[PDB]
Structure formats: C-alpha cells, structure tokens
C-alpha cells in the first residue's frame, strides 16, 4: 500500500499500480446501506433491492432505486443517490440517442459499455471524481435473451447470470453462486423467488411487501415493470408457504 505524491487524491497510479481514488469510489457504493440483487432466468431477469423509509414523513413512493432507463431496459442503482440519478439520466440520454442515430433499441451490453466508457474517463482525468454508484441493467435481448450487466465506478462491466451490488454484495454472491451451481433454468416465479430469497437470507429481514422493490423483464413481455406491493406480496406469501 505504498504512496507517492497525490496518488491518493487524484486518479493517478500508485507505486504498485493502483488507483486509490477509484477504489475509494467503490466504498461509496456501501455508503447508502442498501443491497441490490439481480438474477437472470431462462426467460426473465429480476432486479431486487431493499427500500428503507426511516420516517413516515418521507413519501415512500419517491424512494426508488429501480429506474426505467428505457421501455425495455430497467436498472437498479446502489451507492450515492445523487450520483446514481446522474448515471440514470445519462443512461436514458444514451439510450434515446442510440435509438435516434441507429434506429433500433440499444442492447443492454452496449448501454453499460457506454456508461462504463463514460465512467472510465473519470478514472483517467484528474479534474473529476468517479461516480460512487453501481448500475445493474436488466433487459430482454432479441437473440441473446435475458441479460444482466453490472456497471462499476471504474468502467468495468460484465454479463451476469446472477449479480449483486451494495453492502452485502459478497455474501449475496456466495448465495447466488450456490444456486447457479445447481444448474436450473429458473422460471419467472423461481427467479423472483431466488432474487427475493438472496436478499432475504443475507440481510435476515423476512421482507414485508413494502421493504423491497422488484423489477422484472420477461421474454413474453419485454418491458420493464415495477412490481406492486400486492404483486411482491404474492411472491412473499409463496416463499413463506414452502
């Protein structure tokens, strides 16, 4: 962990080849205290995150980390709330610009690849800080099917069958790793159930249908929709009864 000069204050290399400022942006994902989980099934993709409303004074309808980037693409934001909105607005602009310039809906892989490209410039130029947020896109592709892509502060991005970002990312990764090892092409109900279970088992909350937001995309309806409290209750009831 050697240091030499301003390698801790601006995005320049350390003596061992480390960008500490970029690493510090990763710790900002845990500043919000929320965990997001995304699971991809055979014909659906689900993003689930916990919602916290500390007081009844706050309008719970406005606390949403699930954002409809496009009619067919939705994302869950974890990290700094202010930086998360900036990425969502940028992602919406790029999705709209892609449709205008190219004539077809932006692929999920290309949407974060641009966002990862946008966030990489922050990791090379020293005049701006990396956005302390993590973006997980889900969407149904025309051919590749369901897609899940995480989009880190450093510009790293990858496809995921089941990913998670936030405070409990590593504990939820192990749970999802265990489930995917079983090699089951989950249906829509199983994928929501394993998404809710992963957040529930790691946080140990036994969710009510007001503490988690669930957003799904399915092959039959390739549109991003926010599950209503009643709809989330159906999965919570089904999970409990088994």
């Amino acid at each position: 962990g050697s240091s030499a000069g301003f390698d801790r204050h601006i995005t320049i290399f350390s003596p061992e080849g480390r960008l500490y400022q970029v690493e510090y942006a990763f710790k900002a994902i845990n500043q919000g205290g929320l965990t997001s989980v995304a699971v991809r099934g055979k014909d659906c993709a689900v993003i689930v995150t916990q919602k916290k409303v500390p007081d009844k004074l706050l309008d719970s309808s406005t606390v949403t980390h699930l954002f409809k980037i496009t009619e067919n693409i939705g994302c869950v934001m974890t990290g700094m709330t202010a930086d998360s909105r900036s990425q969502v607005q940028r992602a919406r602009y790029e999705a709209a610009n892609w449709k205008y310039k190219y004539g077809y809906e932006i692929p999920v892989d290309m949407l974060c690849k641009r966002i990862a490209d946008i966030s990489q410039v922050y990791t090379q130029n020293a005049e701006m800080r990396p956005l302390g947020c993590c973006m997980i896109l889900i969407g149904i592709d025309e051919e590749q099917g369901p897609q899940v892509y995480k989009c880190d502060p450093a510009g790293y991005y990858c496809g995921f069958k089941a990913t998670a970002a936030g405070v409990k990312q590593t504990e939820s990764t192990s749970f999802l790793e265990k489930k995917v090892k079983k090699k089951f092409d989950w249906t829509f109900e199983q994928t929501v159930e394993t998404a809710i279970t992963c957040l529930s088992t790691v946080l140990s909350i036994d969710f009510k249908p007001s503490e988690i937001e669930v957003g799904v995309v399915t092959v039959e309806n390739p549109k991003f929709r926010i599950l209503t409290e009643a709809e989330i209750d159906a999965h919570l009831v089904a999970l409990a009864e088994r």
């Binding site: 710790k27 900002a28 004074l57």
Partner: protein
C-alpha cells in the same frame, strides 16, 4: 489530511467531505418546515432578524421559482438565491419548449442534477443550501420535494431543513397531514416553528408563511397577513 479540500477527492472511506461540510452550513441556519396536506403544501420559515435595522421582508427564504412552485431554503442565502434562479430558468425553459407548467418531480430532478454537478469537480464548490420545492395541481396533486447539497431529491409529506430539523420532524409526525387541509395546517406549521425556536438562543424571529393548493388555484403565494396573524396567535397560545 488533504482528503477534504476538493469535491473531486474521495475519502478512503468513500465519502466526499466537501459535500458533507456544505451540509453543515444548512444545519447552522434557521429551521424551515414544509408540510404536504390533503389539498396543498404549506411552507413555514423561522426567519430570525439579525438586527432591528432590517425591514420586514428582508432575507426572504421563501421564493417563487414558478407560478405554481414555491421554494423554502436553508443555508447559504447567496447559494439559495442562485439555486432559485436556476429553478426559475429551468421552469421558464420547460414552458418555452414543452408548453405546460413544469412538473414538480421533474423540476426537483432538474435542479438537483444542477446541484449534483457542483459536487464532482474541484473547479466548483457544492452549494451550501438545502431547499424544498412545493407545488399543487389538479392532476399531479400536492407534491413536496427537498433537495440537499449533495444533490439528493426525495418526496416528502413533511420536511424540515435547518438546525432544529430533528426537533421539527418530531412535531410534524404528530400531525395527520394526509387528512387535514391547508387552512388547518398553516396553524400547525406556525405552531411547530414556534415550538422549535430557541428564545434563550438566537431570538426575535419572523414567521414567513407560504402555500400552494386548491385554495390558491394551484398558485404559490405568501399566506395573507390576516391568516398569518391568526396562526401566530394560535402558535403563541400553544406555548401557554
């Protein structure tokens, strides 16, 4: 230590301290509360007079960023004023492009992104003011959004910004705001501000009241003096 002198520098714990220091400027200002009732939003600002030499109306913390949106501020007043014109120019551009009054959710999201844009680079400093935007319309309904120096905008039923924000929030919680109207709430907003005011500490405050609702036809305006004085008497009586 050098980790808190720029907004483009993250702390090793992943926290931008320059933004957090701007949060402290808001917590050093007087308390402004806003309550979203059944048929509108009512704003109340505890406006201390720093001297008797100031005229009644100086340092107005209640702005009109649009004909249907108000703004209650706390923190650096110069930054609060600057963010007022940004909201005014955002609302003006929205009407000049799309042809209708700017939704408060979009107005809050647009100004907050301007606030957030000053939290990323060392060439600018974060705005040292937190403000609440309240609006009412027949279609969208009463909305109350609060934007902080970091750039975070959440909707609220009742919010407080200032040094007695915690104390005022407890008083707001006792209210049944979702059922009572603006007429019943202006008295309550007056009562809460008087409760949280510290007479032994900085004293001689002025009650600044404003509202937007169906009784103003979706237009933000200062509460008329007759109703404002009536609420003031009720607020003073509640202190026994």
């Amino acid at each position: 230590t050098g980790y808190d002198l720029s907004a483009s520098t993250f702390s090793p714990d992943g926290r931008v301290f320059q933004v957090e220091y701007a949060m402290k400027a808001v917590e050093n200002s007087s308390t402004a509360i806003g309550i979203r009732c059944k048929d509108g939003v009512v704003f109340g600002v505890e406006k201390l007079v720093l001297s008797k030499l100031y005229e009644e109306g100086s340092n107005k913390r209640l702005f009109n960023v649009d004909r249907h949106v108000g703004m209650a501020v706390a923190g650096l007043l110069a930054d609060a004023r600057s963010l007022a014109d940004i909201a005014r120019e955002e609302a003006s551009n929205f009407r000049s492009n799309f042809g209708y009054n700017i939704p408060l959710k979009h107005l809050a999201d647009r100004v907050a992104m301007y606030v957030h844009a000053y939290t990323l680079y060392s060439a600018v400093r974060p705005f040292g003011c937190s403000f609440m935007l309240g609006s009412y319309s027949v279609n969208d309904g009463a909305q109350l959004y609060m934007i902080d120096p970091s750039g975070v905008s959440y909707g609220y039923w009742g919010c407080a910004i200032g040094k007695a924000r915690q104390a005022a929030k407890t008083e707001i919680e006792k209210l049944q705001m979702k059922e009572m109207t603006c007429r019943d709430i202006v008295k309550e907003v007056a009562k809460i501000i008087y409760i949280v005011h510290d007479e032994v500490k900085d004293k001689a405050f002025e009650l600044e009241l404003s509202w937007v609702g169906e009784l103003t036809n979706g237009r933000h305006e200062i509460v008329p003096k007759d109703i404002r004085e009536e609420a003031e008497k009720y607020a003073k009586e509640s202190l026994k």
